[PDB]
Design a protein around this ligand. Structure first.
Ligand SMILES: CSc1ccccc1CN1C[C@@H](C(N)=O)CCC1=O
Ligand SMILES: [Zn+2]
Length: 139
């Protein structure tokens, strides 16, 4: 689990969104596995606005942060799960690293801020849903 809190927004994995996230829906994209909902309290996370390909992510299945090299956002084929059938997920970045389903929501960060959140894994790979293109999260 895990969320990004920026301004009056809350960014989560779409498959993990609650009834409250859906009742206060701002934007959602099934092909990206993202959902943004509105919050009353002001969040103070900083979103990165860059093209970095190195950063650090939090892996709850190991209680550790890991430094990783990751690919640029792209259309990557993702095997079926109980939340989605086999499909292409867009704006997805892969790294060599450990990732389990319960790890979804762990933040990936570079020196500029939050890059994205854990969304996929398996075969020794970890996939992050990118958030750097969502410029409206800051306004
Ligand atoms: C070993 S499978 C795995 C591992 C880490 C993280 C996620 C998975 C599989 N997964 C993919 C998500 C997606 N974005 O389509 C939806 C929920 C889910 O459990
Ligand atoms: Zn950066």
């Amino acid at each position: 689990s895990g969320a990004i809190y920026v301004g009056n927004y809350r960014v989560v994995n779409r498959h993990l969104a609650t009834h409250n996230d859906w009742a206060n829906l701002v934007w959602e994209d099934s092909s990206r596995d993202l959902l943004v909902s509105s919050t009353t309290a002001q969040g103070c996370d900083t979103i990165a606005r860059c093209d970095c390909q190195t950063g650090v992510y939090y892996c709850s299945s190991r209680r550790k942060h890991y430094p990783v090299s990751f690919s640029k956002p792209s259309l990557i084929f993702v095997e079926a799960s109980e939340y989605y059938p086999a499909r292409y997920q867009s704006h997805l970045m892969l790294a060599v690293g450990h990732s389990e389903p319960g790890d979804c929501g762990g933040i990936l960060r570079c020196q500029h801020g939050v890059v994205g959140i854990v969304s996929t894994g398996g075969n020794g790979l970890v996939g992050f849903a990118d958030v750097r293109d969502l410029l409206w999260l800051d306004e």
